Amino acid sequence: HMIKLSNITKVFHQGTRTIQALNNVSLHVPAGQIYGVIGASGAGKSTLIRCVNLLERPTEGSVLVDGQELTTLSESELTKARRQIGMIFQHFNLLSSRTVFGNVALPLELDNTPKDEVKRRVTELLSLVGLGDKHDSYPSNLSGGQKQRVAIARALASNPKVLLCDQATSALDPATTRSILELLKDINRRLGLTILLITHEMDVVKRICDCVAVISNGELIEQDTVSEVFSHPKTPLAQKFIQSTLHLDIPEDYQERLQAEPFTDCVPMLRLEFTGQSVDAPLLSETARRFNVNNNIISAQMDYAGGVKFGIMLTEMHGTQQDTQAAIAWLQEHHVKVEVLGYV
């Protein structure tokens, strides 16, 4: 009951036409947990995350952060509200004129904070983010990673209860994203900071998120624990993103040769999803012996998401139509979700 966005809808009257950004979006982020909202470019990730802070006004709905209604509020009270919700962004939005020290200090000077308390507060957050070294530097000097730590430190300046991330590592590279995401996680785990997160990369969700919602055109299609979404994904669109966190490519020549209608001399290529219980079990070797079947494994990968192992396989199965149907049955029996992609 940390943050509760209920029925959030935002619409635009930008030109001669009215475009709909979000539809009855409802999400609840438990206190001390990390919630990621994932979606394609244009789904309303940006608008949604902005409704929490009320940089954007939801046409209709309810924004309840830390228990307090935010939608209807006095402008002098929204400022009192933002001292609990810091924000970080894709592009870093750091002031080019001020040192990393002053940059972290900036939200504090917005309240009439004493100069003596400020310096103590700033150094700790600079020591926390790993920039305690670079006290006297300007954003033009810092690398992408450095700059993002500053922005996080700055958001953590007001010692906020909730942290929002607007594609925060969408600009940083793979090597750096992980350390920022790990730093961002540690702050949550070590300090209990509630984090809301939007991204378009599923790699991001699985690395640090505890719950996850998949959004497509303003509507939420799958909404559940990270573990349940990475194992037993109920949406085809949801599968697309998961199958991307692991790099599972079907070689160009297969999808061309592969056809959904069964033909003479054909064998089924099927993709298998393993949930935690079956991921480490050598079931494809067992399946080879028991039912006298030959599996041509095209590609396969396993990973962890939400503290739960999972994995996916792409394979064509050779054998008798009776044998094939039998081993598939043994896989479904052993918590491996079998799904036939067609025949080749």
Partner: protein, 216 residues
């Protein structure tokens, strides 16, 4: 060069410096608020009025559209009304600041447009009041733009106080007008001109040396 001539140009150079810097100063005490309150009313901003903007923009465009010598000559009645005089140094510090303000506002608003908008968005996220973001974030980020606008401002105001010297503002504009147009003396005309180019190059050098002093 006469001995009275030397102690005369010195007063000219003084009257010229006094006019450009004071007019520049007043043009900013006025233009800077006009420019900031022009930027904050643009569609999508903190206080976007498509109606208020069109007006404040329409007047600056009109004033800015009026050639200075004409603006000055037409302002002669107001000048005498407010100064009590039409002739002189402090008489000219009036049409020169009114001439300067329309230019300053456009530049200030344009300088503020260099600031990447997410910086504004970031400010609000922290809980910044609309007045705070101006003095805390906007002016500081556009400071090199503004310091640069001021240089370019003072310089147009050198050319401006000069035109004033043909209609009685004094300064080096007067000395070049009397002794270069009406009655001609070679040493007198040339030293006026060379004093004016040096004054511009000094005003440019000083402005740049201050822009180069801001951290990238």
């Amino acid at each position: 060069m006469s001995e009275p001539m030397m102690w005369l140009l010195v007063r000219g150079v003084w009257e010229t410096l006094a006019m450009t810097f004071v007019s520049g100063f007043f043009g900013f005490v006025i233009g800077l608020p006009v420019g900031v309150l022009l930027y904050v009313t643009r569609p999508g901003q903190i206080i976007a009025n498509a109606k208020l903007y069109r007006t404040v923009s329409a007047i600056v465009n009109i004033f800015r559209s009026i050639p200075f010598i004409i603006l000055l000559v037409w302002m002669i009645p107001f000048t005498r009304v407010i100064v009590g005089t039409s002739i002189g140094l402090q008489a000219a510090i009036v049409p020169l600041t009114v001439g300067a303000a329309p230019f300053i506002a456009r530049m200030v608003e344009n300088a503020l447009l260099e600031i990447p908008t997410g910086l504004i968005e970031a400010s609000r996220a922290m809980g910044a009041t609309p007045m705070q973001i101006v003095r805390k974030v906007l002016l500081p980020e556009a400071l090199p733009g503004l310091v640069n606008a001021a240089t370019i401002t003072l310089i147009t105001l050198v050319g401006y106080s000069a035109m004033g010297g043909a209609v009685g503002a004094g300064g080096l504009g007067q000395i070049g007008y009397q002794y270069g147009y009406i009655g001609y003396n070679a040493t007198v005309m040339n030293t006026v001109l060379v004093l004016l180019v040096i004054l511009v190059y000094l005003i440019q050098f000083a402005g740049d040396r201050i822009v180069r002093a801001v951290t990238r």
